[PDB]
Ligand binder design. Sequence first.
Ligand code: ATP
Ligand code: ATP
Ligand code: ATP
Ligand code: MG
Ligand code: MG
Ligand code: MG
Lengths: 70, 239, 73, 411, 73, 149, 413, 228
Amino acid sequence: GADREVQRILLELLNQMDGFDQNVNVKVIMATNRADTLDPALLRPGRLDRKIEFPLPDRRQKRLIFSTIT
Amino acid sequence: SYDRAITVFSPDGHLFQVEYAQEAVKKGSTAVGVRGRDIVVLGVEKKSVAKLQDERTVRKICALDDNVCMAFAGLTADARIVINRARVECQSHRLTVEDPVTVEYITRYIASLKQRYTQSNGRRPFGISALIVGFDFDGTPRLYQTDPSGTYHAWKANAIGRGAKSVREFLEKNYTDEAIETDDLTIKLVIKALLEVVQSGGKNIELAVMRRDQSLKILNPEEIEKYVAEIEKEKEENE
Amino acid sequence: QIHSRKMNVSPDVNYEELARCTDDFNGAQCKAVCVEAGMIALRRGATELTHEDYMEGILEVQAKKKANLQYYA
Amino acid sequence: PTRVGKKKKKTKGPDAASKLPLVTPHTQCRLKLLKLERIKDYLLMEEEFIRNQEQMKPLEEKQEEERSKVDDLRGTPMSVGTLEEIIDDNHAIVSTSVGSEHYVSILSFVDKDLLEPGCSVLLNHKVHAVIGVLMDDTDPLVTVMKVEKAPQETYADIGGLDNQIQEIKESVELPLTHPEYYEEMGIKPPKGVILYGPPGTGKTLLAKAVANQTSATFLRVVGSELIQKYLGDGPKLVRELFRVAEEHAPSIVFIDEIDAIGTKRYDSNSGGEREIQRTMLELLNQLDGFDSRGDVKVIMATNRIETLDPALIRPGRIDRKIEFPLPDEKTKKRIFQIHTSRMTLADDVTLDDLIMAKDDLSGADIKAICTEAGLMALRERRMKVTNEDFKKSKENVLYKKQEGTPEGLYL
Amino acid sequence: KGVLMYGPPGTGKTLLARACAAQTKATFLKLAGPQLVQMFIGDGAKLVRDAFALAKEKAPSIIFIDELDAIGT
Amino acid sequence: TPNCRVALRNDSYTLHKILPNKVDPLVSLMMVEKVPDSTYEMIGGLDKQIKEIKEVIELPVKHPELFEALGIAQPKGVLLYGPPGTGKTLLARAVAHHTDCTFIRVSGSELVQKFIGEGARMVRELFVMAREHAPSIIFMDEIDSIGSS
Amino acid sequence: PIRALDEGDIALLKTYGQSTYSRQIKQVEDDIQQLLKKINELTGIKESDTGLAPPALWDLAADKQTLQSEQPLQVARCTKIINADSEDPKYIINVKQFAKFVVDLSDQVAPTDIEEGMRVGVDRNKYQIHIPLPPKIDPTVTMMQVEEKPDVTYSDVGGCKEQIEKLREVVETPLLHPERFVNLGIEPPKGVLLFGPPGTGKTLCARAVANRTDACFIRVIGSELVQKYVGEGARMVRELFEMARTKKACLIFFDEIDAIGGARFDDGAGGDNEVQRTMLELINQLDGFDPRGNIKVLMATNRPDTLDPALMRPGRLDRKIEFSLPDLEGRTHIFKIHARSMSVERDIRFELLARLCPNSTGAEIRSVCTEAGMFAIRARRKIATEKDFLEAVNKVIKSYAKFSATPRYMTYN
Amino acid sequence: YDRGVNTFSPEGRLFQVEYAIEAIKLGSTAIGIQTSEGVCLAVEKRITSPLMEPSSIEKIVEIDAHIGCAMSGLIADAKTLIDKARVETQNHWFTYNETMTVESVTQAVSNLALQFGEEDSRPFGVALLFGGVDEKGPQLFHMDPSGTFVQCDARAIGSASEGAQSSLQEVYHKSMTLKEAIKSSLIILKQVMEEKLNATNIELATVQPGQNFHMFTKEELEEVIKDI
Ligand SMILES: Nc1ncnc2c1ncn2[C@@H]1O[C@H](COP(=O)(O)OP(=O)(O)OP(=O)(O)O)[C@@H](O)[C@H]1O
Ligand SMILES: Nc1ncnc2c1ncn2[C@@H]1O[C@H](COP(=O)(O)OP(=O)(O)OP(=O)(O)O)[C@@H](O)[C@H]1O
Ligand SMILES: Nc1ncnc2c1ncn2[C@@H]1O[C@H](COP(=O)(O)OP(=O)(O)OP(=O)(O)O)[C@@H](O)[C@H]1O
Ligand SMILES: [Mg+2]
Ligand SMILES: [Mg+2]
Ligand SMILES: [Mg+2]
């Protein structure tokens, strides 16, 4: 019990994102830790079109964060 | 409900791991066998060939000596070892004692081999059940069977495999007090008993006979087709 | 003996027998042994107790029961 | 006295359907044209006889002075109350719907014998006095659960289950039709019967077939009908349902899927499981109420039996446990005989071949094959059904569940 | 002002505390554990404070608490 | 009438009027009231699946006497399944646009509400609301919820 | 190669096959089911009763001596009293469905008999106490204090005589001989709970000594102590333990105490919604008002989970009497019980039966005796044979119980 | 606790051997009576099928030409103990030119009835009755999987053990004869079995002093049945 309660909150989220109704002009921004864990039904486009990875920095972006703080 | 060791008794006194091996017998192919007046016979239920393989390597009936036969159920891995072992013992007996091997001696060996193999941990018991047929002991036809517990036992007619209970109930209403002489009549008994197969395709039967003096005679699927025709012909006359 | 003051006890009581036979017992169970000994003497209707009645009370507390067990000659 | 209260003065209302179950040609024949037009004749006349009944009654009544004034002596919006206790001095203590309890008078025209604690009465608004006792009427929730129409076909509909059909007929139909046998040995009939097994086997069929051919009042309760949320509505209905079953016939109470109302009795302190559990407990109590059950038979039916409360399963409550297995290769011949009867069967088919190749399909599997093979003939534009439609129906319907076997491992 | 008695079982937990106020007469005040536990919400805490404040109004009174491990968790 | 509500005069409790529209609480997304979202032609590449569903919805409803003449029971249940998400919803919305029939949308997780009871009784109150508009098609979203095991 | 069906192709199916009787048989069946409906709303027979009396005796009653009960008589409610005060009433009273009130008595009474926990007549507006009423004596106790002989013989529960001997010593010996207690110097035990497997003889050993008491006996329904309204079940268990302690030599039998039970001295007791109202009030009145009583109370349940150590603290409950299975001779006695009263053969032996019943209850033993009779009904019989019982034991025990796989036996003979 | 023979209870005990005694209880019944004229012996067959050949079911085996045997419980454990008991009398004759006495047979048998965990396997599942005529007259003995060896005057084991022993103490006395005790035995057998007793349900075995041959009855058994 109550682990299918977590699992059905996914399903209600999947329905009101890609059900019949197609609620236009609403926008969904999600952010996680490690995202290899999660459900592939989220990751299909039409629902979660944009896949953006943040690196740590790299070099030439250490410079830019050094600039903006100092 | 401890069923995870072989050296433990239940609080009502059982060995469930011995009991679970006999359930693996019931997923095996059926085989029956009767003894006759002079000619013994046994038959098997052969499964369907899958159209792209050779069928001389699916052997389910073997001979240990020149005068004793064998039919089994269960799983073919454990069956191959017991066959290969018992061919040695019926040969080594002949060396130590110059007689041919009686049908009763070789079943005590197979049962005792399955016996001592049950007792120690780390020795998963043989999930097969054998039928041993031979008119070998001085013109006397006999048939026995084994059991995964390791208990050899003598019948006069037998059935194993999936749904043997239907066949064993069938034979008690069919095996007459009339000892079926005229040995094609005795073969007609087995082919009619295996005509009450789980499927009874007609072309899926392999019967093996022994006329107590020859070698093993595997029948051919034209002679066996002749006996299936006369069974349906004589059954139509009964109406 | 404090708890057995209020009942008819046979005055043949070996407390050395009662001291060592008790093990892993609190005084709650030791009170219970004395009352259960008196209840068994009521079952047979005897007026008095015995050390065996305390030993029978010991078997009654943790619910033991014996027999002949045919391992033990 | 000897015959105290003469046993609640109460009749029974059985079913009214099974008007004429003799349509026995079962085909396009002039007999069924003649049979049904006879049935049309008797129903039109029974319509026209009662039409003339409310027609030719010149009465034009004038009410009696005593009855007309008492109807105005009572209030016009009468309210329904409940007796709790009685003091015989023309005033007693009753209860409202909310439970407010009032020392109201009772009027001296109420037929002061029907006053028993638990009986329903009528009340006023001003002084809330007992105007008149109401007859033992129930809520609309239980009246839906009383069957009006005999549903479907008789024991010829099912495809061979006769080892178990002869069991239930001994436990239900035989004690009602012929209770001579039991008194010949002084043996009481069994009380409760549980039907269990794999699904799609015919548990609901045998419930419908008994409800077809019976003279009992058949009550239909399905599981989670019986669960509500107003803190007493659960155990109230069980008392009301078996009061109705007591006052009416030697009766049959069919409760279906009691696994949704009984499993092993855990008692978490949260007030969600108690309402289940209090209702669960009182049904088991009202089962063995033993006051006067008056031959009320109870039939219960689930799929799994292992997840049940063992207090239900024990004898004393329920005496019969019946398995409905996946049958055989023999009664399959009868189900294929039945479900292919009303269709133009072509003479190329060997339906034994389908029974031959398979071992564990059910009755609902067979009916799905018979519908699908008929649909395949419509696809290739036919009426008769070849062998090939049954081949394509067997492949299309069956392969959705079959998973897991050690092929090659055995032989 | 807080001294705690503990041991394997009692007969020695209550019994020593029974021995404590038997010969110390300074206004003994016993209190048990689930006697605080009511269906009344908060009247556990109400009875805790009001009995303590009553024992504070008495000048020599000591406070006993019986099976505090019923809520000592 | 069954489940008949009446207008009751609040003073003297007299029957003011028979009220129509027998009880339908929370039937909002049921009978959608606006169909056009996607058409029958814009799917593509799924023609066999379209043909089977039309044979099980449109064929039994438009011509019931064909099955009566043949002597089989008409089917009523369809399970659609596909792992990644491939057209499961469009084909339902196309039938929603092209049926000329009462069409009920139930994303089933909305029958759990909070209470003992209430989450179940509306299922009974659902099919009688579908029986009222007697030609009907009821749709389930995502039975990986209620209906598991 | 799939083809679907055009509109002309529909007409091929719909035409062919009895185009003379197709609709001719069908619309007759169609409109007759319409006619089944049209009879039913045309009939609509249903009529009322409304419980009136014959007008021979109520016409003079229906005179002004109804209005003399309308306008002079009142509509007063009933309540309970928490407590009182001295020299001045200031009474505290709960409707408990409405609020609790601080009220007065009306002038028609004396302040004597307005004691605590009493039903009183309460004004609708000023809420004054009008008439004190009894606690509704006595259907709250005597409807389960039946004081009636039950039909259970002493020879019915034979075979468990030592568990009976425990209960015969605990119950009977103080109630009729509290003299050897003085002759020895002891006092009787005053607490016994029963638990064990269902259908063992729990209610039997209760009802057998309820038959052999010649005295007051009370059986208590476990769900009766569970009530719908909050604060109502405790009020009942008040009234039970008060008016049972009045008369002497009585017995109370609690049964199915699972609903009112649970360990309240231990980890749980996080309940407190009308179950603990019953529970806390009963453990209040179990001690406190019982030093050296006369009325013994017995509990019985199927679940040994719900043991309270506060009950099992001595003073409330003392002894754990549980019931067991019969060895053989108890079983063979029970088979003779359930078969002496039916049409049997005079030559069957029952010791052969109890061999085949290793772990079984008398509920199952009774079920075999009924089932064996059912086999006699299958054929034309009127007396049971040996094999009738032998099929019944196979049908009951060797089918659903803990033994299967009978054909693969061949290891034991 | 139990789950293994290398473990004690807090009270005693096993808890493993106790379960081995339970495995005897589902065997077939068997009665032997010691009498000064000789030891008789009886058993019940419990045949399942008519196709099942009856003489392959052994319950009386011949240990030696003056000692019989009777078993219950597990057949698989029994065939090992029968095999050694024939060898132990045979070695004793080889090195002493004499017959091993009936008591000292079972000493050799019990010496690996108790070896099950005493090496450096499970206990057996079989109880035995040994009857024989040695130099001290006729003897009857009984053992168990716990190796507890004892002498009995008239013993009955297997299923219906307690039901036989209660009835069997009623009729036994010291001055019985052999022909009396045979028909005294099978009266108890038809009381405790379930089928009608005939010539196919039971079999006998008697050993006499002067009749070291023929520990058996072969269809003279039909004559004893009608002498009921
Ligand atoms: N033995 C049978 N003979 C004829 N028809 C059968 C049989 N078994 C099943 N059927 C068909 O299967 C359908 C469903 O059977 P039914 O629902 O009664 O089985 P069930 O065990 O009640 O299944 P569930 O428990 O899932 O409801 C019936 O309408 C019937 O037509
Ligand atoms: N076969 C197809 N033809 C045309 N468009 C498709 C197809 N499959 C998916 N799409 C596109 O994918 C989008 C989402 O389709 P849909 O909502 O059916 O996903 P789904 O199959 O319901 O997924 P899930 O059931 O896993 O949520 C739609 O906008 C649709 O245009
Ligand atoms: N020991 C016994 N001796 C005689 N009859 C018995 C015995 N045990 C059970 N019975 C039979 O079973 C019935 C008694 O069951 P009992 O009243 O003990 O059930 P119970 O303990 O009340 O069950 P539960 O505890 O589940 O309510 C009697 O009708 C009797 O025929
Ligand atoms: Mg069903
Ligand atoms: Mg979707
Ligand atoms: Mg009971």
